């Protein structure tokens, strides 16, 4: 979580012990159930946990898409999320292949889903 722009900006500056609310889902719960929202969220954290900078490249590619002043995550449409979940999905696999030096066509499908989900 600390690898996000906003949250680091708040936790670095604040000089007192304090509580701060955020809404992690921005406004995603208009068009998305809590289930799939939590699911995408954990995918956006797992790709930020591992690669970091190269995930943040996937998020911040197009500057035309802007993070609002309220939200954390940049405001996409539904389809842009459907592709970005696939890229953020890809970093976990390419990185896994880099780490254990396993060419990833050697894995069973279950092994892929497990890799993506831990």
């Amino acid at each position: 979580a600390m690898s996000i722009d906003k949250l680091s900006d708040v936790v670095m500056k604040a000089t007192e012990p304090q509580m701060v609310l955020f809404n992690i889902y921005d406004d995603w719960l208009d068009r998305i159930s809590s289930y799939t929202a939590f699911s995408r969220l954990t995918l956006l954290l797992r790709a930020l946990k591992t690669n970091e900078e190269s995930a943040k490249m996937i998020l911040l590619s197009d500057p035309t898409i802007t993070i609002k002043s309220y939200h954390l995550w940049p405001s996409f449409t539904d389809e842009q999320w459907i592709t970005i979940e696939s890229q953020m999905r890809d970093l976990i696999l390419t990185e896994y292949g880099r780490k254990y030096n396993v060419n990833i066509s050697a894995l069973t499908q279950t092994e892929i889903k497990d890799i993506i989900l831990g």
Partner: protein, 633 residues
Amino acid sequence: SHQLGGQYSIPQDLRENLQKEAARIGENEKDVLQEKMETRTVQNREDSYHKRRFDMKFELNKDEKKERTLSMLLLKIKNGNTASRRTSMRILTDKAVTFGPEMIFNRLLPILLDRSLEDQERHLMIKTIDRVLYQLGDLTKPYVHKILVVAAPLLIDEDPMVRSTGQEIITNLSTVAGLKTILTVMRPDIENEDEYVRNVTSRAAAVVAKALGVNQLLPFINAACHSRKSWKARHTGIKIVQQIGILLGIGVLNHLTGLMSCIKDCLMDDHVPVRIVTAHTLSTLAENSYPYGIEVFNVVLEPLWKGIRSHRGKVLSSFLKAVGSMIPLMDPEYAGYYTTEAMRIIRREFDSPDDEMKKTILLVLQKCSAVESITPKFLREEIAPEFFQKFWVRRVALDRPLNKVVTYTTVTLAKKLGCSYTIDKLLTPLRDEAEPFRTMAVHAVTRTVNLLGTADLDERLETRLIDALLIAFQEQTNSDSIIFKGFGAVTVSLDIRMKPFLAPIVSTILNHLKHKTPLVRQHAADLCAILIPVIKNCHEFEMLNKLNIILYESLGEVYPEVLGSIINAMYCITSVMDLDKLQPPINQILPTLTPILRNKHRKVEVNTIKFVGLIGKLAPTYAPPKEWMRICF
């Protein structure tokens, strides 16, 4: 010219600028009805090559009534009601004799040369030539030239149904017009300059050869092949030997000595296009012969190698095809020598981008597995890895004529190579993105596993194979049998070993039966009928009753293609499993089927009647007899 108000639509002069374009651009467009107007006419099936049929050269008041009648009959047959032409065929077959065959053929044959006629209309005309030629029995030479102008171009036609009915004529005409007459008509035709006309009557004179026997026709070929007069007579005189060797199949043989007069001496010609043709006409005589021939092919084996060791180019592709197909009929002493000779050439030619060579490389690999001398270790170490990477490119999987070869070649190499080695290499294509390439790599696995059996596979490939199939199963789009037989030929082999893999598979069946697209609910149920004989061997009767109920609750489906295949899986579970322990149970199943017998279609009626009759055998006592009488009606 001031306007009142303004412009709100588009400027007025701009529409006409648009509506003029549609006249200019539209006349080149081929509108919907314009398209279907042409598609009807048979010429859209044909390449520029086949178009040459029309380039080919074709050359009282009481009796003026017969001149109409035939032209009326020939009209009724071609364009006529089905009850009309049926009466006008009966009139021809009886009365063909009394009408002048001049009048029939001079009137009948020109139709077949127009550019208009549809395929339905053409086959009704050819069927009249065949029925007329059968009777008269004495036919003059002028028409024998005409008939072959019409009939022979069929032999090159796209589809085999037309190819055969063309062949059916010439074998009838060959007997009618006799041996002496036809061989006079080919002589000026084989010396002809035009290519298409020569390619046509190689195939025509060969059909004549089978009907009358080749010996009667052999001195004709010997005159053409050995002819120093024309170069082209040598060429086409050699093609006549192919379509004699292709038609006569195995039976060439005893004639192979007389034929060899043509081939060898006509091979030495300085003209390469002749050099090349004989190199093919040997590979056909070599294969069609098979084990018996070699004693006649030693004479030709020497000049091939001096042609292989030098000329390269496309002469190398043809000579290797000949030498490649002599191998299996050589003695084990030499056969081991020439392959290890030829396997040097292939290793050098795997990088050849040409098609003509790749078709030759496959033939030799195909025939060099059966040689004892190469070890299966040599293949795995060298030939195998340079095979699967070059011949399994996605550009291969698209065109069928080169797919059937690469899979057959793969399957034969699977006897020397391990079963675990080939299946190991076929996992990259089974998971590939391209559809037509996943289907190719399935045919190679189904075919392989039937030969070798799955006992070879270490546990890891056994798990990776099934993951590759389920994937390649669940992305299929088009409906084809190959995935199901394949996924069903794997299970049958390893069946008791399947048990751990059978839990997650059945979960995806139950997951795809909830999918919206009705194709996916076919393949979900089509893959249950396959797994039942394997599930029972693994002895899950708690896992059949789960499938069975789920197939029962879906038995009121709308889509007939889907409802049919669910009953099919119901019929597989019921016959396999005990009746007494069937979960629904039976007495609740049978009354649900009787209103399904009214479902029209077929997939539902067939698969149901097999299910109902099953219960008549196995459990008659459940439904009361007035229920069986509701079924008998």
